[PDB]
Design a protein around this ligand. Structure first.
Ligand SMILES: Nc1nc2c(ncn2[C@@H]2O[C@@H]3COP(=O)(O)O[C@H]4[C@@H](F)[C@H](n5cnc6c(=O)[nH]c(N)nc65)O[C@@H]4COP(=O)(O)O[C@H]3[C@H]2F)c(=O)[nH]1
Lengths: 171, 171
């Protein structure tokens, strides 16, 4: 349905272009340690706050990842921005990674509240699931994701910082 | 179909957030003249190059518009970038505006070349048209677009700089 298109937009205009350069940007930050993979949080309830630190205080913002620039569809040197977070566990830095929500899920939530979008509020979870299922299929066949990306789907029924650490510790 | 979702993504996560601040950013640039509207080019053939100057040399890049920052889905101070262009006509500056292609049309073109996207190459024009028709409906009912945005649909069968100037001169 709609989720099918946003998943492809998410990969065409973002992951396909910045994943090939992520390791290089992480290397640049360490010297001039952060983990070598982009962690994407996929709350299937489509509850995407704009500040990760408020969804969980154990997720502490640290610094910005070095910018990436690319001439895109008439915008000269368009900036792409990522955020580096520290994950605390009983007041102890247990990890550090490039962490972010999947913005398109936030778009699904908004589409559902607009009247003329023809998107009922009950179809959120079904679309969030189809978005996750469509993205996994793409990245399983994507060379850009040569072990450079990890998805974190979950359904708040709970510590989000613990869920991130679980995947991070297995790295 | 697919175009319906990208048009809403285009408005939810971009135009709805940066149009309320465009005039202020243009004001800041003039003093610290540029036109007071964002011009979006919608080539219905989905031919979106990344450098406007090459689609037409009479379109000359000038400078960057002052950045806009916003906490978005876990990315602290995410930068939004626009480009200011000069439109030449027989070697004379005939206009100056914030000009850019509609990136989502570029995404439609790419989706059509990927095999697993289930998007045939022949459906481009139909989707580019549905994208334009869905965006016009949104902006006709959008308060954010309080005479702050102008769409430029066209089908290359021709001077793109002349097409932009035609809309710009009527402003
Ligand atoms: N973390 C991070 N994620 C990023 C970054 N860039 C993209 N993504 C992800 O990829 C999705 C699809 O990106 P696009 O194919 O480019 O389609 C965009 C584009 F057409 C327009 N748009 C957005 N920002 C700007 C801008 O600064 N300047 C101009 N001129 N246009 C802009 O709005 C559409 C929907 O944006 P949205 O944010 O909802 O979904 C994005 C987002 F999820 C990034 O820097 N950082």
């Amino acid at each position: 349905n709609v989720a099918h298109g946003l998943a492809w937009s998410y990969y065409i205009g973002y992951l396909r272009l910045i994943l090939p350069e992520l390791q290089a940007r992480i290397r640049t930050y360490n010297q001039h340690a952060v983990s070598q993979r982009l962690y994407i949080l996929l709350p299937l309830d489509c509850g995407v706050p704009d500040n990760l630190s408020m969804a969980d205080p154990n997720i502490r913002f640290l610094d910005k990842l070095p910018q990436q620039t690319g001439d895109r569809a008439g915008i000269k040197d368009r900036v792409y921005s990522n955020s580096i977070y520290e994950l605390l566990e009983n007041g102890q830095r247990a990890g550090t990674c490039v962490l972010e929500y999947a913005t398109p899920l936030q778009t699904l939530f908004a589409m559902s509240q607009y009247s003329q979008a023809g998107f009922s509020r009950e179809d959120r979870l079904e679309q969030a699931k189809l978005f996750c299922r469509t993205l996994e299929d793409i990245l399983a066949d994507a060379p850009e994701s040569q072990n450079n990306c990890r998805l974190i789907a979950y359904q708040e029924p709970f510590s989000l910082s613990q869920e991130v650490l679980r995947h991070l510790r297995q790295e």
